[PDB]
Each structure stands twice: as C-alpha cells, then as structure tokens.
C-alpha cells in the first residue's frame, strides 16, 4: 500500500491487555493468523514480568510495541525506556505532553539501542478533551520538530483525525486505539491511520478469532 | 495527619536490587517513606515492593505516573495495590475520568492515590505549567487528598497550596540534583522527595544527615 513502510498485517494492532499470562497467551495465539503485532501494556508486564515481551516475540514471531506512556523528567524517561528496550521492545509509547527534552530523552535511547518511539499526542477517553485537546496540534507539531515519524492518534471525527494527518504528514506512521469497545470504527479510522489498535473487541470476545477475522472482514 | 519521618522521602531510582536494599537500609534511619518507580520496578519486577515492606517496615509510594484511559488506569492500580503499595501517584492531565478510576481502585483496596499536578523538569513549562491550577483544581473537585507538586518559586508551590488548602497532603520532587532547597520547599510541601543527591552520594547516610541537619528547625 504505501512503498516507504511496510503495513502490519491486517493493519490490526492487538492491544493485549489481560492480566494473566495463560490467558494472554491462548488469546494471543487464537488470533495471531490474522495480526502480527501486538501492543504490550503495563496491565500484562506489571503482573507477569518484563519478561512476557521476549516470551511473546519467541512464540509468535510477532513485533511487541511497549505501551508504557512514558511521562516522567528526562532522566527517568531515560532509565525506563532502557530497560524496556533491553527486554526486547520493538517500540515505546511516550507522551508528548510532558514536553520536549522528555520525548529527546527518550528519542536518544531509542537511537542509541536501535528502536522506536512512538508519540501520543491525543487521547481517546472523555477526559483526554480537559487539557490534552486543547495541546494536541502543540503537541504533534513539536513532534515533527524533534523528527519524530511514529504517531498515537485517537479514531475520531474525520475533521479531527485529518488535522493530525495534516501535522504529521503523509509520511509519518500513524496508528490508532479506540476503536470498538470505545465506539470508534475500524474503516472509517483506516482513511487517516495506517493501523488500527484493538483491545476488548478481541480479547474479551467468546470467540476472540472470529472478532478478529470479523474486523478485518468490515474492511 | 503524621509527618512522614523527618518530612524525607527517598526516591529508590537504583536498577539493582542489592545496591538499592543496601543505599535504602544504610538511609533507615532517617527516612521511613520510599518512593519506588519504573525504573527498579522493570529491572527487578514487581516483587520488590513486597521485600522492601518487610525488610524496612517503610511506606511506598509508586511512582507509575499513571496516564492512561480509565479503565487501562484501573487494571494497573490493582496490580500495583495487590503488589502492596501504600499509594500511587497518578498523573491530572489526562483528566478526571482517568483520575477517579484509580480513586475508585484505591477506595477498594483500602490505599491512597496522589495526584501529580505539575512538574519539575523544563519540559514541564511547555503545556503542564499551564494546566497546573486547573488539574490541581480537578483534585479537589474529585475529592484527592494527595498532591505532587514541584520544589519550585515560592509562588508556584504557595499558588497550588492555595488550591489545596491547608488540610491537603503535598509531596515535592526536584530537591538537591534538580536544584531544589530543602528548606524552601518544605515552607509549603509536607515532605521533600530526593533521589540522587541520596542515593549517588559516596555516603548515602551522610547526604541523608546533612539534608535533615540543615531542616532541623522545620521538624
Ligand atoms: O488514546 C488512547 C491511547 C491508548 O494507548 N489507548 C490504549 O489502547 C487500548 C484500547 O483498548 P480497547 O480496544 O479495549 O479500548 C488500551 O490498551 C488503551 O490503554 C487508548 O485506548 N486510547
Ligand atoms: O515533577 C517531578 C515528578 C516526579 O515524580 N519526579 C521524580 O522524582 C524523583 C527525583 O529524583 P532526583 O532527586 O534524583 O531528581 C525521580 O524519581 C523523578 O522521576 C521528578 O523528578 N519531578
């Protein structure tokens, strides 16, 4: 689709947030016919250990984004974003909102270590329209001048997600969580993102496949 | 309310689980609140606020910055209370439906939630500075007792213990390395966080002695 960036597959990020690592794991594997990258929050890795990201990339093959929403000072985002490389994370997950010299601390790393980051600049849940709406372009537009290429844009109105596309560019890859249990729709996010993310949908369905194949099929 | 001891809250930053158990027992004495977070949690797992309970008899505080939606928010309060944290520290800017999932955690697990209203670092001036007032305001609205604000001018730290009120409990990073005083932070903070001014010191003991020394009259 695009010759710059490969797509994951499907275009379907697995947002793996069950707590049990028996649990994940069946789930993960239920479903890994149709996605072969999958997003790792702190839900799994606070209750299994960091060392659930090298078993899933062992099984599966699979890429593991970290989402750790990194915001703390520089020298912290430092230390975190180091370990979690370490422990075999394509990419990370940073907010942009605690400003610039957090997303360079955690931009160094990634370049030191040979990986990603990729930047939330806008939220999904009512509360993100208190203080993260209003500071989202802000936001996405001091992404641009750190260099950042890697994007977390919520589904939303298209007039809404077109700006961020805008900001960030036709280059830039962009992908996107709340998208079904939140209300948003995988196609019509799709004319803006280049992924999808999906969390419940999938893992809390009684048949945890067939949703997957179901959302691909809407597509 | 009591005063953590000697208004000192050690911030437990050490990637290695022998350095950080001797630097915090050689510190004891003076300190009996530790502030524990990402970067010792991802390196030596979520089992060393357990041992760092029973070994110090000590309070902790993790430091997770949660910044996620509410009900990602909501699994990792519960991984981190069943771990045996006393309190979280949750970030204000992703707003309140974010904030009351972790106050409504805590309400269940019997533990507390402390919310991060403004920070330390430059980063912070560029879109956290501005939303300070209203995220501490939020708080109150929300009903929080606990509040992280920045060693910082006299007026920025009185402004947020003005929002607060008096009956409200206030801890402060950014003293010693940061360029913090002591002194100066604990005239409106009701303990004084520091981390590497401690825990880098060639007498992590005598570091911790000079800094209650020089606050003596406030205790
Ligand atoms: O704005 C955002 C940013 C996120 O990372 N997320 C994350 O994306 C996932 C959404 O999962 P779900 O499809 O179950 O709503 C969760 O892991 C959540 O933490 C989000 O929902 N909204
Ligand atoms: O505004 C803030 C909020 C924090 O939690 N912190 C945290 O407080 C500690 C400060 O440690 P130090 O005294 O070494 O600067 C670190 O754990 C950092 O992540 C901060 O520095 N500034």
Redesign the pocket.
């Known amino acids: 689709r695009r010759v710059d960036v490969m797509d994951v597959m499907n275009r379907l990020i697995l947002?793996?947030?069950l707590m049990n690592r028996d649990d994940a794991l069946r789930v993960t594997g239920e479903v890994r016919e149709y996605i072969d990258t999958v997003?790792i929050?702190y839900?799994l890795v606070l209750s299994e250990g960091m060392d659930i990201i090298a078993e899933f990339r062992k099984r599966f093959g699979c890429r593991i984004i970290a989402?750790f929403?990194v915001a703390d000072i520089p020298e912290t985002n430092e230390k975190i974003c180091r370990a979690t490389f370490k422990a075999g994370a394509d990419a990370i997950?940073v907010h942009g909102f605690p400003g610039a010299d957090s997303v360079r601390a955690c931009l160094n790393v990634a370049e030191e270590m040979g990986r990603e980051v990729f930047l939330?600049t806008?939220?999904?849940?009512p509360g993100?329209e208190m203080f993260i709406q209003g500071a989202a372009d802000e936001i996405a537009r001091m992404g641009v001048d750190l260099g950042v290429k890697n994007y977390?844009?919520?589904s939303a109105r298209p007039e809404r997600l077109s700006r961020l596309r805008e900001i960030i560019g036709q280059d830039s890859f962009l992908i996107s969580?709340?998208?079904?249990?939140?209300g948003?729709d995988p196609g019509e996010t799709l004319r803006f993102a280049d992924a999808i993310?999906?969390?419940?949908?999938?893992?809390?369905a009684d048949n945890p496949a067939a949703a997957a194949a179901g959302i691909i099929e809407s597509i």
């Open positions: 947002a793996m947030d997003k929050g839900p989402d929403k997950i939330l806008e939220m999904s849940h993100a977390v844009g919520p969580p709340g998208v079904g249990a939140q948003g993310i999906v969390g419940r949908s999938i893992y809390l």
